Design a protein around this ligand. Structure first.
Ligand SMILES: [Cl-]
Ligand code: NA
Length: 129
């Protein structure tokens, strides 16, 4: 499913991401935009053999099981395919674990390089949240 900007904003808010660990909703929408272009089915293979899944491009090396990333952890306790669903719940719940992991949202390269320090409020402007 390819979410609309405000549709995703509302879904993320409903799932408790607004200000989760101090990160305003605009941060989450911006990260999703640049990680997956709001597409829940996005996947990208990394050089180490791991793969990123879903709207938040969660990595199989640590957070989910895809059965093809040797010696990886499954810290979110879910098959990576769960992260591609039209229902963002699994992605959000896992993201909460990631963001609490100590490095905050810096865990998402696109957020660090494209959202961090920018006017992220712009990502929710105009939405009825
Ligand atoms: Cl933080
Ligand atoms: Na894994």
């Amino acid at each position: 499913k390819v979410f609309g900007r405000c549709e995703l904003a509302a879904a993320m808010k409903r799932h408790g991401l607004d200000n989760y660990r101090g990160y305003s909703l605009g941060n989450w929408v911006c990260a999703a935009k640049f990680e997956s272009n709001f597409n829940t089915q996005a996947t990208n293979r990394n050089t180490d053999g791991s793969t990123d899944y879903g709207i938040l491009q969660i990595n199989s090396r640590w957070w989910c099981n895809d059965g093809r990333t040797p010696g990886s952890r499954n810290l979110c306790n879910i098959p990576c395919s769960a992260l591609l669903s039209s229902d963002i719940t699994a992605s959000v719940n896992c993201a909460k674990k990631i963001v609490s992991d100590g490095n905050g949202m810096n865990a998402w390269v696109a957020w660090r390089n494209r959202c961090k320090g920018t006017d992220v409020q712009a990502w929710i402007r105009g939405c009825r949240l």
